[PDB]
């Protein structure tokens, strides 16, 4: 639930607009891409420092670095995910965002 795994912000009309994390979108292809990125990071590490091993830190960093390259999910999911997000919330999704001169706000 930590804000370190933020994936999308859904602008629910009724307010309390909800933050969808990576857990809400962990598809199998996303998991394979994450493990491949971790493997690439391990390869870079073994080429940089020499030691032949795979670190848990590689996986931990791939967790946060997977979103650096979008997996075609943000703003482009099927209406099934939007429907489920709305059904759980009970409100229509006005807009989704990735994570002036209009009056005065105090």
């Amino acid at each position: 639930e930590i804000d370190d795994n933020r994936f999308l912000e859904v602008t629910y009309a009724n307010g309390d607009k909800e933050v969808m994390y990576f857990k809400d979108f962990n598809s199998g292809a996303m998991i394979q891409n994450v493990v491949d990125r971790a493997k690439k990071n391990a390869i870079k590490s073994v080429l940089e420092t020499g030691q032949p091993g795979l670190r848990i830190q590689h996986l931990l960093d791939s967790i946060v670095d997977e979103f650096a390259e979008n997996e075609d999910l943000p703003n482009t999911t099927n209406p099934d995910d939007w429907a489920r997000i709305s059904g759980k919330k009970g409100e229509r999704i006005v807009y989704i965002r990735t994570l002036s001169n209009l009056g005065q706000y105090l």
Partner: protein, 215 residues
Amino acid sequence: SPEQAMRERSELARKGIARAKSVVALAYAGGVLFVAENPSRSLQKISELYDRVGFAAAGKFNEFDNLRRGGIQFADTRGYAYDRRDVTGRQLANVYAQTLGTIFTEQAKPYEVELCVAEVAHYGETKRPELYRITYDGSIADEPHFVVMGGTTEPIANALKESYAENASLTDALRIAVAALRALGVASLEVAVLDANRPRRAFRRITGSALQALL
């Protein structure tokens, strides 16, 4: 269309509250403490409403100052029509709820505002401070310890959740409130109290060098 027309207005109101400064109100030994992040020296977000009833708000100013004025009007008309000790924080909170609901389902644009009405006991009397939060829906919630309004409320609300202590003195509650608000000097803070020890008018601002000493 029923909910669809209403919900669209709600999204705009929630967005406006998010683009605004944060205010906190918490109970302490001498009453209630309002601490707001406010750069201007003229425009305010904390106000006396009646003898023992205070008021804080966050969101479009032309709107929550309109409510500030309406509430002052109401409270004084009641106090004169009946008596001063008859106006209570509860009535005021209820009027704000009715009024924010009526704006939500009739006016063109919903008031992007969030209100907190506070009340303390009378002089030489004993009773716990009451905090109410009124949202743009017309919803009203009874808070036992503290209210956080405007901006990102989660980190401030959690920091207060760890630091809060009932019967904290004025200085401790000020430290806790500024600390949780950071999650700022006297030139960027608006601080006032509902001092339960005052004989009649309980609201009292803490500015300048006195504020400097307290923090």
